[PDB]
């Protein structure tokens, strides 16, 4: 059912070494990401995200996005600041994009409140203001959401600028991975 208290889950957003991030731009990504989840199935009853904005010594070896994320997730496993928090959610953030204007990446279906471990729930996101909702889309993937046929959904495969989950399938998956059950209502 509804838990006795919302679970504290940290979303730890690490500025890539060498990147320059701007405050309003990163704030927009983090608030859009938080709101995209809280808007679903009354999820503030189940989770209160602490978005943490910090830094990392890691930088992607190139513009190769898959290489970049594989290296970022590995870097977390021996990052002394992240010790004891292998069950949280992590984003590497930069100003620009990756090769061919890739906007972000994520490990799909990598966070569940019961099994989270080993820094598996991790991804990367641009923060440029012209790409609202990228972190929210990647967080959706981390929570198990798949691409949708509806082009007005946050989880359309193509960037559209939209910010909200519309797919009932995705909303059920995301909420289930955060402890929700259908009998709980919204």
């Amino acid at each position: 059912a509804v838990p006795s208290e919302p679970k504290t889950v940290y979303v730890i957003c690490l500025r890539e070494n060498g990147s320059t991030i701007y405050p309003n731009e990163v704030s927009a990504q983090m608030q859009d990401a938080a709101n995209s989840v809280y808007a679903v199935h009354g999820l503030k009853r189940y989770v209160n995200f602490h978005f943490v904005l910090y830094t990392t010594e890691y930088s992607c070896p190139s513009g190769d996005a898959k290489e970049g994320l594989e290296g970022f997730t590995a870097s977390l496993k021996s990052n002394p600041k992240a010790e004891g928090y292998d069950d949280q959610i992590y984003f590497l953030i930069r100003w620009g994009t990756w090769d061919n204007k890739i906007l972000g990446m994520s490990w799909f279906n990598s966070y569940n409140v019961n099994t989270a471990s080993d820094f598996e729930a991790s991804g990367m996101s641009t923060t440029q203001l012209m790409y609202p909702g990228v972190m929210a889309h990647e967080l959706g993937h981390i929570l198990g959401a798949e691409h949708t046929d509806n082009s007005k959904d946050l989880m359309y495969a193509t960037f559209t600028g939209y910010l909200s989950h519309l797919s009932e399938k995705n909303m059920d998956i995301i909420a289930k991975n955060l402890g929700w059950e259908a009998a709980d209502g919204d």
Partner: nanobody
Amino acid sequence: QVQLQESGGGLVQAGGSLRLSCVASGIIESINTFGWYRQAPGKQRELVADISRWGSTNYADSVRDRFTISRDNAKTTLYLQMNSLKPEDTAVYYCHAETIGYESGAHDYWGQGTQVTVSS
């Protein structure tokens, strides 16, 4: 997921004007950048003018203040007003749309090209 069709080319004399039009059909909100490219014989294709989904425009230095790009309210039609034309503007002009996948990046869609010939 989008289809582009452009028109308006022709032969004009130096100093003349032409107005190009491009109509997009399909998933219009997938268009991140809507624009015009051109290719002249022996030369590489080059950006002429484009407009972002947020309304920001870019022009090639050589056409700034002679050409104007615009997009209609419905977002399906792109215009290129070409004034004060020069022989250096002779080219096949292509309508273009960039889509961006969150994880996959940019994909290019093209029109068929419309020939522009500027005689002197």
